[PDB]
Amino acid sequence: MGITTLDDPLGHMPERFDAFICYCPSDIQFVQEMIRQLEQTNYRLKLCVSDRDVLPGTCVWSIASELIEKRCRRMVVVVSDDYLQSKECDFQTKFALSLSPGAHQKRLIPIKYKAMKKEFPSILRFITVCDYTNPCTKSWFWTRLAKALSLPLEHHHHHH
Numbered sequence: 422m423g424i425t426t427l428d429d430p431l432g433h434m435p436e437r438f439d440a441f442i443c444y445c446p447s448d449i450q451f452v453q454e455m456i457r458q459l460e461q462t463n464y465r466l467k468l469c470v471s472d473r474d475v476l477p478g479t480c481v482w483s484i485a486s487e488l489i490e491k492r493c494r495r496m497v498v499v500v501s502d503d504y505l506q507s508k509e510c511d512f513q514t515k516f517a518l519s520l521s522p523g524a525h526q527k528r529l530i531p532i533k534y535k536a537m538k539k540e541f542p543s544i545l546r547f548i549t550v551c552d553y554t555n556p557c558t559k560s561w562f563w564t565r566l567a568k569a570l571s572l573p574l575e576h577h578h579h580h581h
Contacts, residue, residue, distance in 0.1 A: 422483045440495035442470045447503035451534040463567030502537040
């Protein structure tokens with residue numbers, strides 16, 4: 422685990438990780454639901470998380486913080502009141518800072534299960550958020566997130 426070799430639950434993927442999930446412990450139940458409800462209805466994914474000691478099964482494993490860019494294409498940013506104030510947001514921010522002023526933004530997808538009052542950090546400030554709290558987009562929501570993930574950042578191949 423961590424950075425140790427011989428670790429490859431998925432048979433060592435040259436594909437690497439698609440996205441890294443960072444979320445708040447206070448709204449963990451929604452995230453636990455998300456990861457499994459993705460795989461049950463999606464175009465096949467393979468992700469990882471910051472804290473994996475919890476979660477229901479979830480096919481993920483531990484990687485290096487200094488290698489998040491080298492391991493995962495994207496980061497799933499769970500924007501909750503507890504997230505914006507907890508270490509999790511700072512972690513995601515440090516990653517985004519090592520990427521690039523603009524490119525990082527396309528590499529961070531903000532997910533919102535609830536509706537808070539807190540203000541946004543400029544490092545993400547909602548580029549393209551998917552509100553699970555709104556039944557309008559909560560229909561093929563997991564498949565929509567899965568679509569946005571399965572698409573490599575924004576590699577313009579599928580038409581445009």
